[PDB]
Amino acid sequence: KTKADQEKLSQALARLAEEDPTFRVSTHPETGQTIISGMGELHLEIIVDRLKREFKVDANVGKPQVAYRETITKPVDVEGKFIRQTGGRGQYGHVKIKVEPLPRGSGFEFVNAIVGGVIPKEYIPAVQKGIEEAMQSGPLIGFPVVDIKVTLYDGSYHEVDSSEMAFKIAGSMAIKEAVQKGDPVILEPIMRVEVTTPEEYMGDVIGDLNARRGQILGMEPRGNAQVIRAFVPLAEMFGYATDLRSKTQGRGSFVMFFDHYQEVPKQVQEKLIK
Amino acid sequence: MKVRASVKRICDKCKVIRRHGRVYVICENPKHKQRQG
Amino acid sequence: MLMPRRMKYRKQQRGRLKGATKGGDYVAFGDYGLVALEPAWITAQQIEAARVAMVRHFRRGGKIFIRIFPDKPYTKKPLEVRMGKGKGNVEGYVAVVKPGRVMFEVAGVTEEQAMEALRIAGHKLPIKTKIVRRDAYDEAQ
Amino acid sequence: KKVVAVVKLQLPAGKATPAPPVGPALGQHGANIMEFVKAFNAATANMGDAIVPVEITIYADRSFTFVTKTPPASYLIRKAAGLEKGAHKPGREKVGRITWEQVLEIAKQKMPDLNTTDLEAAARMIAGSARSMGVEVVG
Amino acid sequence: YRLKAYYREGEKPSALRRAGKLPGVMYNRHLNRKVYVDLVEFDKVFRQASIHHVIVLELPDGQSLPTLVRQVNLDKRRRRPEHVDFFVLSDEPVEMYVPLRFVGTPAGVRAGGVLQEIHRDILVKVSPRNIPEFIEVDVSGLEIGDSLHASDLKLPPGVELAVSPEETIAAVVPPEDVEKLAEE
RNA sequence: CAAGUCUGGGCUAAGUGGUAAAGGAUGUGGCGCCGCGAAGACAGCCAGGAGGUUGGCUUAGAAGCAGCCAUCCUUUAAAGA
C-alpha cells in the first residue's frame, strides 16, 4: 500500500526470513513489486496473516507482471535529422539508418556502414549511445525494444555546428521511429515446464496445460510416473502449483525454465494497450 | 437449450416429443433437453 | 455495400408493390437459385448481410451472382422533426423485389452446399423465399 | 506376483529399452527386457529399421513369449521408390513408382501374413496401398 | 418420346388449367391447331425430353407428329408452364438448340475456379432426319483466365451452326475464398 | 331474441372458433408419385461383424472415428480403408 507500509514489510521479512528459512523474498530487479516465495498456497497464505497482523502491514495481493519486449516485423529506413541553425552554435546532426528485425533472441547489432566518412569519426560513438539509448521504452508499452540489427549507412554533418550531442539525438530519432514504422509486435516470455505425473492423472493434466495458451512437446517417462514437457506464457502460468496438485491430488510436481520470447496473439496486442 | 421458440434436433439421439400439447425434445445429453415456449 | 455510381435524381417517389416480377424470374446463370415469394424493399445491407454468410458458409466455393441491384433511394426525414419542409434525405438504398424474382443464384457447388447457404440467406432476408433448380428455365430470352 | 497377459505391444526395430509401454505391462511379465534386443535384432539385423509388431504373452511362473509379424506394408514400398513419406495427397502427385514385378516381389515378403495364398491377390493388396500413399505402379 | 395430346375447341383456355390440363398449340408454316396436354405426363416428359429431343404427339386422329417445344411460357408467380408451342418438325431443315457436352476436364480442375456454362445450348440447323445430340466441346488445356468461344466445335455430318460464331461459349472464373479482404 | 337444436357429405379437437409475426413441430385428416415383398422382407434374437493396415500426409499423438486426401484389396455367407 502507501509507501508507509512498504517499510513495516521490510522488517516483516527481516525477521520473518530468519524465523523461517523455507522461503525467499525477492524484489523484482526491474520494477519495485516484491515476490513472496512459498511452497504451497497455505504457506504463503498463513504468512499473509502474520505478516498482515503481527506486523499490521496491509497491502495488495495480485500477481506478478511479465517481462515483455518490443520489436518489429518489417525492416525500415528513416532519416535522422536534427539541425537547428539560427545563429552561432548551429547544432547540426543528421544520419540515416537501416533497421531490420532479427530472430527472437538475436540481440543488438549495429552497422558502421559509413564509406569514406561522410559522418565524421568523432561522432559515431555518440550516435550509438543515442540509438542504444532510445531502444529503452518501447513504442507499444515502453519495454526493451530488442532483437534487432541496426545499419548506419548514411548521414552528413556541419563543420562547426555539429555536436557530439546533436548526433546522439538524431540517431535517437531514427531509432525512435523506425520501430513505430516497421509495425511493432509485443514479444513475451515462454517457459519450459516439466510436470511429473502418474499417467493416471496425466489425461487431464495435459488438457489443462493446453488450455493454458501452451503447446505440448513430449513425454518420456520417469520413475513409475511420466513427465510432460512444453512451453507456456508466464502470464497464463501463474499459481500453477495449486492447479497441478489439483489434477493430481498431490502426486504432481513441475519445474519451469525460461527459454525464449515470442509474439502475442494480436487479440492480446490491443489487450495490453493501457 | 431449455425454453425457446425454435426447438429442433440437436443430434439424432434427440427425439421430438409432444406431451401435453407442448412440443418437447429429449436426448441422452441433458443439454439437448428442450421444450417450446 | 453496393449502389449507383451516378444518378439523374437524388430523390425518387415511393410507388407501390404489385404482383408479378416483370422479369428475371428464371435461372440463366447458375445451377441453383433463390427466389422471392413476398414482395418488399430489401436494403443494401440485407443483401450484403446475406451475400456474406452466403459465401461464408462455403469457404472456397463457386461464384454467386447478385441478380438484384438496388437503385432506389431510401428516404427518411431527420428525427424529431415535423411534416412539411420539403422531402427527406437519403439514408440508404433498396432494390424493389417482387414475387417470382431471382435474387441470387449460385453456380458451381455441391447441392448440399447450395441448398444450405440459401437456407441461411433466407434468414437474413425479411421475406420468405424458394430455392429453385434449373429444369424448365430453358429459353427465357 | 502380478497377473497374466496377452500383451499386444508395438515395438520398433532396435530400440529395445524397458521403457514403456514395455514397463507397466511387462513388469507383470518378468520380461527379459534384454533378451529381445538380441533375439530380435539378430533376425532384424537384416532389416535394420521398420517397426515390428509383437504380442508378448506371460504365464504362471513369471515367463514370457512373443510372436512378431512383418514390417508394415507401407514400408517396403517407401524404399522401393526412393520415398520416406507417402505423397501427402494420394492420387494427384506421383513421387515415384513400382513396376508390375516390384509389386510381385513384395507381396512375396508379406504373403504369409495377409490371407490370400496367391500373388494375383496379394499383389493387389500391395497395389491398393500404392494409391494409399500416392505411388503409381509401373505397368 | 410420346405425349398424349388433344384438340381444344377454344373455350376457356383457363378452364383447362384449372381443369387439370395444360393448354397448348402446335404449328408450322402450314398448319396450326390449338391443343392441350396433361401436366403429369408433360412434366414427366418435358422434365427430360425438353427442347433437344423431339416429342411425337399423338392425337385421337391417328396422327403422331414430331415436334419441339419452341416456347414455354410461364406463370411467373410460382413457375408453372402455362402454355407450350409445339413446332411440328418435318423433313425441311430447321433450327433448334443442341446440347453441349463439355468432354474433358480442364485445368481449373485441380487448380480451381468454376467452369461457366455461359451457353450450354446452341442454335444450329439440320433436317429432322439427323437428330443430333450432345455436341462435344473440347476442353483440357484451359486454366482460370481467358476462355474459348466462336465455333470451335465438332460440327456433325450435316449440322451447320446458325449463331455467329464469336459468342463467348464458356469460360472459367476464380472461386470465392472466405478469407480475403481488400478494403483496407 | 323473431324464424331449422333442418337435411346429406367432409374437416376440427385447441374452446381453435372468440382477432397478430418471422420461425418451430412423428399435429391430424387427404391426394400423390417412387421402393422392398414369403429363394422370408419392417421391428425384429442369437450370431459373425476379420485380415493388408497404427491407410498416406500432418501432429504431441491420429490407429475406421481432429484434419487433409484416398477409398484399392482381401478371405467370404458377409464386413465400409
Domain CATH code at residue A269:
3.30.70.240
Judge whether A5 lies within some domain: no
As given in the structure block, the three cell numbers for residue C29 are 446463370
Q: In what order do the strands lie in the sheet with A108-109?
A: A79-81, A94-101, A148-154, A108-109
Q: Are residues A266 and A180 in the same domain?
A: no
Residue closest to E173 by CA, chosen among C64, A262, A5, D102: C64
Residue carrying C-alpha cell 514403456: D20
As given in the structure block, the three cell numbers for residue E108 are 481449373
DSSP label of A88 = S
Amino acid sitting at position C36: A
Can you tell me the distance from the alpha carbon of E151 to that of E119, in angstroms, rounded to the nearest whole number? 12
Judge whether A105 lies within some domain: yes
Q: Report in angstroms the alpha-carbon separations of D96 from A126, A259, D72, D131, E144.
A: 62, 42, 19, 11, 29
As given in the structure block, the three cell numbers for residue A3 are 509507501
Can you tell me the distance from the alpha carbon of D18 to that of A109, in angstroms, rounded to the nearest whole number? 49
Q: How many CB atoms lie within 10 A of CB A242?
A: 10
Residue carrying C-alpha cell 420539403: C86
Distance B21 CA to F1 C1' (A): 39
E24-52 exposure pattern, b = at least 16 Cβ within 10 A, e = fewer: bbbbbeeeeeebbbbeebbeebbeebbbb
Which residue of C64, C129, C135 to mutate against E (max E Cβ within 10 Å)? C135
The alpha-carbon radius of gyration of chain B (Å, integer) is 9
Can you give C90-141 as a three-state secondary structure string?
EEEEEEEECCCCEEEEEECCCHHHHHHHHHHHHHHCCCCEEEECCCCCCCCC
Q: Which nucleotides of F are covered by protein (CB under 7 A)?
A: 14, 22-27, 50-58, 60, 63, 68-75, 81
Question: Checking DSSP bridges between strand E97-103 and strand E135-138, what pairing results, if any?
Answer: parallel
Q: Report in angstroms the alpha-carbon separations of D38 from C138, D41, D45.
A: 77, 5, 9
Q: Are residues A57 and A73 in the same domain?
A: no
Residue where a domain stops, chosen among A145, A172, A187: A187
Q: How far is A213 from chain D (nearest CA, A)?
A: 29
Can you tell me the distance from the alpha carbon of A201 to that of A192, in angstroms, rounded to the nearest whole number? 20
As given in the structure block, the three cell numbers for residue D119 are 500373388
A181-193 exposure pattern, b = at least 16 Cβ within 10 A, e = fewer: ebebbbbbbbbeb
Q: To 10 degrees, what angle do helices C44-57 and C111-124 make? A: 150
Q: How far is CA C75 from the centre of its chain?
A: 18
Residue carrying C-alpha cell 504468512: A47
Residue closest to A250 by CA, chosen among A259, A241, A239: A241
Which residue of C27, C63, C98 to mutate against E (max E Cβ within 10 Å)? C63
Q: Are residues A52 and A94 in the same domain?
A: no
Q: After which residues is chain B broken (C to N over 2.5 A)?
A: none
Q: Are residues A62 and A136 in the same domain?
A: no
Q: How many CB atoms lie within 10 A of CB A51?
A: 20
Cis, bond preceding D21 (omega within 30 deg of 0)? yes
Entry field: residues in chain D = 139
Q: Are residues A174 and A125 in the same domain?
A: yes
Amino acid sitting at position C105: E
Could you tell me the domains of chain C? Answer: 29-137 (3.90.1170.10)
Burial class, A157, CB count within 10 angstroms (exposed 0-12 / middle 13-18 / buried 19+):
buried
Q: How many CA atoms lie within 13 A of C112 on its CB side?
A: 2
Can you tell me the distance from the alpha carbon of D24 to that of A221, in angstroms, rounded to the nearest whole number? 11
CATH number for the domain that contains residue A136: 3.30.230.10
- Phi/psi zone of residue E104: left (φ > 0), alpha (ψ -120 to 50 degrees), beta? left
- Contact indicator for E124, E101 with CB cutoff of 8 Å: no
3-state secondary structure of B12: coil
As given in the structure block, the three cell numbers for residue E102 are 463439355
- Contact indicator for C119, C48 with CB cutoff of 8 Å: no
Can you tell me the distance from the alpha carbon of B20 to that of B9, in angstroms, rounded to the nearest whole number? 19
Residues of chain C positioned with their CB less than 8 A from the CB of E115: 108
The alpha-carbon radius of gyration of chain E (Å, integer) is 21
Q: How far is D19 from chain A (nearest CA, A)?
A: 7
Can you tell me the distance from the alpha carbon of A36 to that of A43, in angstroms, rounded to the nearest whole number? 10
> CA nearest C52 in E: which residue?
E178
Can you tell me the distance from the alpha carbon of C61 to that of B35, in angstroms, rounded to the nearest whole number? 37
Residue closest to A232 by CA, chosen among A262, A202, A197, A273: A262
Q: Which CATH number fits domain D1-69: 3.30.565.10, 3.40.720.10, 3.40.1710.10, 3.30.1550.10?
A: 3.30.1550.10
Residue closest to A99 by CA, chosen among A148, A53, A51, A144: A148
DSSP label of C77 = P
Q: Which residues pair with A230 in a beta bridge?
A: A193, A216
Number of domains in chain A: 3
Segments in D21-114 forming alpha helices (H) = 76-79, 103-109
Can you tell me the distance from the alpha carbon of A45 to that of A38, in angstroms, rounded to the nearest whole number? 9
Q: What is the CATH number of domain D70-138?
A: 1.10.10.250
Distant-in-sequence, close-in-space partners of B6: CB < 8 Å, separation ≥ 6: none
Judge whether A264 lies within some domain: yes
Residue where a domain stops, chosen among A145, A171, A187: A187
Residue closest to C18 by CA, chosen among C132, C101, C137, C124: C101
The beta-carbon contacts of B6-10 under 8 Å, at least 24 apart in sequence, are B7/B34, B7/B35, B7/B36, B10/B34
- Contact indicator for A76, A45 with CB cutoff of 8 Å: no
Run of H or E residues at A260: strand A257-262
Can you tell me the distance from the alpha carbon of A204 to that of E160, in angstroms, rounded to the nearest whole number? 74
Report phi then psi at D96, rounded to 5. 165, -175
Q: For residue A172, give its domain range.
A: 69-187
Can you tell me the distance from the alpha carbon of A124 to that of A152, in angstroms, rounded to the nearest whole number? 9
- Contact indicator for E126, E158 with CB cutoff of 8 Å: yes
Q: Which residues pair with C41 in a beta bridge?
A: C96
Q: Which residues pair with A253 in a beta bridge?
A: A196
Residue closest to C95 by CA, chosen among C3, C20, C1: C3
Can you tell me the distance from the alpha carbon of D98 to that of D133, in angstroms, rounded to the nearest whole number? 12
Can you give chain E as a three-state secondary structure string?
CCCEEEECCCCCCCHHHHHCEEECCEECCCCCECEEEECHHHHHHHCCCCCCCCEEEECCCCCEEEEEEEEEECCCCCCCCCEEEEEECCCCCECCEEEEEEECCCCCCCCCCEEECCCCEEECCECCCCCCCCEEEECCCCCCCCEECCCCECCCCCCCCCCCCCCCCEEEECCCCCCCCCCC
Query: Which residues of B does the annotation place in the binding site?
Result: 11, 14, 27, 32
- Phi/psi zone of residue C133: left (φ > 0), alpha (ψ -120 to 50 degrees), beta? alpha
3-state secondary structure of A233: strand
- Contact indicator for C93, C72 with CB cutoff of 8 Å: yes
Q: What are the sequence ranges of the domains in chain D?
A: 1-69, 70-138
Burial class, A153, CB count within 10 angstroms (exposed 0-12 / middle 13-18 / buried 19+):
middle
Residue where a domain stops, chosen among A126, A153, A187: A187
Can you tell me the distance from the alpha carbon of A132 to that of A109, in angstroms, rounded to the nearest whole number? 10
What resolution, expressed in A, was reported for this entry?
A: 7.8
- Contact indicator for C21, E77 with CB cutoff of 8 Å: yes
A214-224 exposure pattern, b = at least 16 Cβ within 10 A, e = fewer: beeeebeeeee
- Contact indicator for B33, B26 with CB cutoff of 8 Å: yes
Distant-in-sequence, close-in-space partners of A168: CB < 8 Å, separation ≥ 6: A93, A126, A127, A129, A130, A133
Can you tell me the distance from the alpha carbon of A23 to that of D138, in angstroms, rounded to the nearest whole number? 72
Q: Report in angstroms the alpha-carbon separations of C43 from C20, C122, E17.
A: 20, 14, 37
Listing DSSP states for A30-64 in one string gives TSS-EEEE-SSHHHHHHHHHHHHHTT---------
Query: Which residues of B does the annotation place in the binding site for Zn(2+)?
Result: 11, 14, 27, 32
Residue carrying C-alpha cell 424458394: C130
Q: Which residues pair with C85 in a beta bridge?
A: none
Report phi then psi at A152, rounded to 5. -80, 110
Residue closest to A124 by CA, chosen among A84, A78, A82, A93: A93
Give the torsion sign (CA, A7, A12, A18, A20): negative
Can you tell me the distance from the alpha carbon of C35 to that of D51, in angstroms, rounded to the nearest whole number? 60
Q: Are residues A63 and A162 in the same domain?
A: no
- Contact indicator for A99, A71 with CB cutoff of 8 Å: no
Question: Checking DSSP bridges between strand E26-27 and strand E83-88, what pairing results, if any?
Answer: parallel
Residues of chain E positioned with their CB less than 8 A from the CB of C19: 77
Q: To 10 degrees, what angle do helices A41-53 and A5-16 make? A: 120
The alpha-carbon radius of gyration of chain C (Å, integer) is 17
Using the CA of D77, give the nucleotide whose C1' is nearest: F56
